[PDB]
Amino acid sequence: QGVNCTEVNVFQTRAGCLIGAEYVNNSYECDIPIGAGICASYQSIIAYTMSLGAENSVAYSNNSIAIP
C-alpha cells in the first residue's frame, strides 16, 4: 500500500499495488476490505470493484400505484 510495485499479475491501485491477483472486469462482493473501492477474494485470486447492490430503477408513474 501507498507505493507502486515497479520500484520494489500485479494490479496497481490508488491505495497500493497487489501482487498475485488477476483483475476481472466483473464486479462482485468482497469480504476482506482493501481500500479505495478495490476488493479481492479467493478464486488464483480475483480482484475487482465492490458491488454497490442490485440495480432497480422503476419508472415513476403519477397514475399507477403498486399496491401489495
Partner: protein, 404 residues
C-alpha cells in the same frame, strides 16, 4: 390561517482519516539495536497495531451503517417532472466530473514526515451514488422501499400522506399545490444562498480536521523534543557517545516517545468513541427521519417534520430537513361542548371555532371552518355536568332527505 415553508440544516461528522504508523521507525527510526532492545520490552507495538485496526474497522462499520442502508440501487427517472417541484439542486449533475449535486459540489468546495495515512475504503463517489439512490427511493417510491420492495407512488400522494401524518388534510394541499411548490423552491434557493454565504456553516468538519492537524503537529514537536537528554537525534548520540554508555539516555528517549504516542493513541480512540456516538445518532436519524415519516417531537429538526434530503459530505453528512411551521394566527371563540336538545355535543376530530356569531369546526393546526353536523360530532352525557358549554343547534343532513 396560513402555512410557512420551513427548513433547517444540520451537520454531523461520520469518520476521519485513519492512520497507521509502525512503532519501530516512529520511535527508534532505522536503528536495529533499538528494535532489538524494544523486542523484550513488551508487546506494546502489537497492542497499538490491534487498536488502530480496530479503529479502522469500526470507522468503516460506522460509514457503511450511515450510508449503505439499502440493498437496491435506484436511478433517477429521465423525466424530471413530479407535478411542478424542482429537483435540480439535489440531483447529481452529469456534466460535473464528480457526479454530484450543485449543493454537494458547493459543500465539497467549502470544506478544505515519518507518518502514513490510509485512504477510506469507500470514496466520495460511491457515497454520492448511495445518497442519490436513496433520494430516488424516497422520492419515486416514498417509504415503501424502506419497509420492503420498492413500490411506485405519485409525488402529490406522497405530500398528501406526509401532511396527513402530522394532521393536515389534502384539500389545502390541492388548493395551493403551485403555491407550495413555489414556496419550497424559494426556501431551497434561500438556504442554498445562505450556505454559499456562510463559511462557518460546516465548522464541525473543519474543527475535526484542525484538531487532527494540531494533534499530529504536537506529536511531531514531541518527537523533535529532547525530553531532557543530550540531543534529540539518536544517530548523533551513537556516533559521539560511548556505545557502552547512552543506554539510559536512549531508554529515556524511547520511553518519553512511548508516553507521548500512548497519550496520542488514547485521545485518538476517545475521539473515535465520540465520533462513534455521533455516527450512531446519525444512523438513527437516517433510519427514522430519512427512510420514513417520524412523529417524534423535536427529533428531525425544528417544527413539524415533513421530509429530509440527506446528501454526501466529506468526512460527514448534511441534513436537508424540510419541515412545516404554521403562521398567521387569529383570535377565535372556544367552547368545550355544544348544548343541543339538552345533550352535549363534542367534536370528533376538531375544535369548535366561532367569530362571535356562528359556531363551526376546524382542525387544531389550520383554520378550516365547517358546518357542525351529526356525522362529524359525537353525543355523550349532558350539559350541566360540563363547564363552559354554550347553546347552538346541530344540522342534521338526514332530515332534508325525507322532508319532501
Amino acid at each position: 390561517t396560513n402555512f410557512t415553508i420551513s427548513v433547517t440544516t444540520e451537520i454531523l461528522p461520520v469518520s476521519m482519516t485513519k492512520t497507521s504508523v509502525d512503532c519501530t521507525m516512529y520511535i527508534c527510526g532505522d536503528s536495529t539495536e533499538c528494535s532489538n532492545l524494544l523486542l523484550q520490552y513488551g508487546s506494546f507495538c502489537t497492542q497499538l497495531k490491534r487498536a488502530l485496526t480496530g479503529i479502522a474497522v469500526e470507522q468503516d462499520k460506522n460509514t457503511q451503517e450511515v450510508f449503505a442502508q439499502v440493498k437496491q440501487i435506484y436511478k433517477t427517472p429521465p423525466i424530471k417532472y413530479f407535478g411542478g417541484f424542482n429537483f435540480s439542486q439535489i440531483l447529481p449533475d452529469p456534466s460535473k466530473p464528480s457526479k454530484r449535486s450543485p449543493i454537494e459540489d458547493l459543500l465539497f468546495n467549502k470544506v478544505t514526515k515519518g507518518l502514513t495515512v490510509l485512504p477510506p475504503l469507500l470514496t466520495d463517489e460511491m457515497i454520492a451514488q448511495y445518497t442519490s439512490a436513496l433520494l430516488a427511493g424516497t422520492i419515486t417510491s416514498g417509504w415503501t422501499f424502506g419497509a420492503g420492495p420498492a413500490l411506485q407512488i405519485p409525488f402529490p400522494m406522497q405530500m398528501a400522506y406526509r401532511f396527513n401524518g402530522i394532521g393536515v388534510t389534502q384539500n389545502v394541499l390541492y388548493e395551493n399545490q403551485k403555491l407550495i411548490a413555489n414556496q419550497f423552491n424559494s426556501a431551497i434557493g434561500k438556504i442554498q444562498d445562505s450556505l454559499s454565504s456562510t463559511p462557518s456553516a460546516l465548522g464541525k468538519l473543519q474543527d475535526v480536521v484542525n484538531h487532527n492537524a494540531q494533534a499530529l503537529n504536537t506529536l511531531v514537536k514531541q518527537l523533535s523534543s529532547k525530553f531532557g537528554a543530550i540531543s534529540s537525534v539518536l544517530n548523533d548520540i551513537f556516533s559521539r557517545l560511548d556505545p557502552p554508555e547512552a543506554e539510559v539516555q536512549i531508554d529515556r528517549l524511547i520511553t518519553g516517545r512511548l508516553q507521548s504516542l500512548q497519550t496520542y493513541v488514547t485521545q485518538q480512540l476517545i475521539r473515535a468513541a465520540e465520533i462513534r456516538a455521533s455516527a450512531n445518532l446519525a444512523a438513527t436519524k437516517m433510519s427514522e427521519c430519512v427512510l420514513g415519516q417520524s412523529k417524534r417531537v423535536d427529533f428531525c429538526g425544528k417544527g413539524y417534520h415533513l421530509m429530509s434530503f440527506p446528501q454526501s459530505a466529506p468526512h460527514g453528512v448534511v441534513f436537508l430537513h424540510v419541515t412545516y411551521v404554521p403562521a398567521q394566527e387569529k383570535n377565535f371563540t372556544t367552547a368545550p361542548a355544544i348544548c343541543h336538545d339538552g345533550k352535549a355535543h363534542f367534536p370528533r376530530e376538531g375544535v369548535f371555532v366561532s367569530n362571535g356569531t356562528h359556531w363551526f369546526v376546524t382542525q387544531r393546526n389550520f383554520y378550516e371552518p365547517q358546518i357542525i353536523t351529526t356525522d362529524n360530532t359525537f353525543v355523550s352525557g349532558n350539559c350541566d355536568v360540563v363547564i363552559g358549554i354554550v347553546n347552538n343547534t346541530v344540522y342534521d343532513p338526514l332530515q332534508p332527505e325525507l322532508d319532501s
